[PDB]
Design a protein around this ligand. Structure first.
Ligand SMILES: [Ca+2]
Ligand SMILES: [Ca+2]
Ligand SMILES: [Ca+2]
Ligand SMILES: [Ca+2]
Ligand SMILES: [Ca+2]
Ligand SMILES: [Ca+2]
Ligand SMILES: [Ca+2]
Ligand SMILES: [Ca+2]
Ligand code: NA
Length: 422
């Protein structure tokens, strides 16, 4: 051609996306002589205005002003390249037109949010007031602010239980907690870009909330009233019952120790404070006391320990043949007339067993032509065939009394009956 070789414009401000498949055309540049050339013979060329490696990411067609990516771009890597392109002429006074491209890469939500911590290992205490700030999640997206407008939702789990601020990302109790109800908690959160450019992006974290204990459950006694039965005859330091209670709480808040409040005056029972184990530790006697009932007290090991002093062990002693029958008056004296009729009461044999049941009930018997008989129950000795002094003046036999007892203890004594004149 002829005249000054130029470009329409000394400089251009194109702008493309972040990921744009290699070879993405950008600008068509055309040099133009002032006086239209018959034989315009024009080479284009290009460089990176600053650093050689920013050149390496574009190309031109030396032939036309074709300007395309030599590789997919990425904003986070470089947010702007700046290129300088020159046209060249084979004229004997060789001609150059000189121009500048400002490329500006745009974001494409290529990155997804990233949690500062892959999973959260956290812990709340129970009977803690509503809306208690438990914990706060953070994530981060290396993307333009519109592909990093983070919004945290509880994807699943406890959602009923705890609350998440969609923006703040702050876990908060939605009701008073209760460990005894609810040991541990699992909830799976989600951080979302609210991404625009291709769409949104997200990644999730598991948050493990462990509920921490508080002495809030009293220890309940296993049986309401623990009924129990001892032979008076029981051997010493012998076990009788294993009182037990349980505390729904955990750690030392469930640790229990037992102890007597009442009824074990005059020893005769010891409570092993950790066993819960009741041992007669001294002789029992049914004839002294037939029955205990002794209140028992179960205690936590908490900061404020709790207490259940509504413990009851109603004990019942059982009789044994330790006592032997024993008479009103061991010397038994009688004076029967001879003319008294048949089946006539002479004397009343009376004995007594301290023992209680059949260990008390007495069968009488006699220990020697004998003119007397004895009632086995009443202990009355009546007459049987008449007699006169001349053949028999005076009688001296015995009488023997017995328990209806397991080993039947018995005792006997003697009776005197002087027959008398009409
Ligand atoms: Ca991006
Ligand atoms: Ca993003
Ligand atoms: Ca509780
Ligand atoms: Ca508790
Ligand atoms: Ca407790
Ligand atoms: Ca006794
Ligand atoms: Ca007895
Ligand atoms: Ca007896
Ligand atoms: Na990218």
């Amino acid at each position: 051609g002829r005249g000054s070789l130029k470009f329409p414009m000394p400089n251009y401000q194109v702008a493309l996306f972040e990921n744009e498949p290699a070879g993405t055309l950008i600008l068509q540049l055309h040099a133009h002589y002032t006086i239209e050339g018959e034989e315009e013979r024009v080479s284009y060329y290009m460089e990176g205005l600053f650093d050689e490696r920013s050149r390496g990411y574009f190309r031109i067609d030396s032939a036309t002003g074709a300007v395309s990516t030599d590789s997919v771009l990425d904003r986070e890597t470089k947010e702007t390249h700046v290129l300088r392109v020159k046209a060249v002429d084979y004229s004997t006074p060789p001609r150059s037109a000189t121009t500048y491209i400002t490329v500006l890469v745009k974001d494409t939500n290529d990155h997804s949010p990233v949690f500062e911590q892959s999973e959260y290992r956290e812990r709340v205490r129970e009977n803690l007031e509503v809306g208690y700030e438990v914990l706060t999640i953070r994530a981060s997206d290396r993307d333009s602010p519109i592909n990093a407008n983070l919004r945290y939702r509880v994807l699943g789990g406890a959602w009923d239980v705890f609350q998440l601020n969609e923006s703040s990302g702050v876990v908060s109790t939605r009701a008073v907690l209760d460990r005894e109800e609810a040991a541990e908690y699992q909830l799976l959160v989600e951080a979302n870009d609210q991404g625009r450019n291709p769409g949104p992006l997200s990644a999730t974290a598991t948050v493990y909330i462990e509920v921490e204990d508080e002495n809030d459950n009293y220890p309940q006694f296993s049986e309401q009233n623990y009924v129990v039965q001892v032979p008076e005859d029981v051997g010493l330091n012998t076990a009788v019952l294993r009182v037990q209670a349980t505390d729904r709480d955990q750690g030392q808040n469930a640790a229990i120790h037992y102890s007597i409040l009442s009824g074990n005056v005059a020893g005769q029972f010891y409570l092993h404070s950790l066993s819960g184990i009741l041992d007669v530790i001294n002789p029992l006697d049914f004839e002294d006391v037939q029955k205990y009932s002794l209140s028992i007290k179960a205690q936590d090991g908490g900061r404020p320990p709790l207490i259940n002093s509504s413990g009851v062990v109603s004990v019942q002693v059982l009789d044994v043949n330790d006592n032997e029958p024993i008479f009103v008056s061991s010397p038994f004296q009688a004076t029967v007339l001879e003319n008294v009729p048949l089946g006539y009461p002479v004397v009343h044999i009376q004995a007594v067993d301290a023992d209680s049941g059949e260990n008390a009930r007495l069968h009488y018997r006699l220990v020697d032509d004998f003119p007397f008989q004895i009632h086995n129950s009443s202990g009355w000795i009546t007459v049987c065939a008449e007699l006169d002094r001349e053949e028999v003046e005076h009688y001296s036999f015995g009488v023997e009394a017995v328990d209806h007892g397991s080993p039947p203890m018995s005792s006997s004594t003697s009776v005197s009956i002087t027959v008398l004149d009409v």
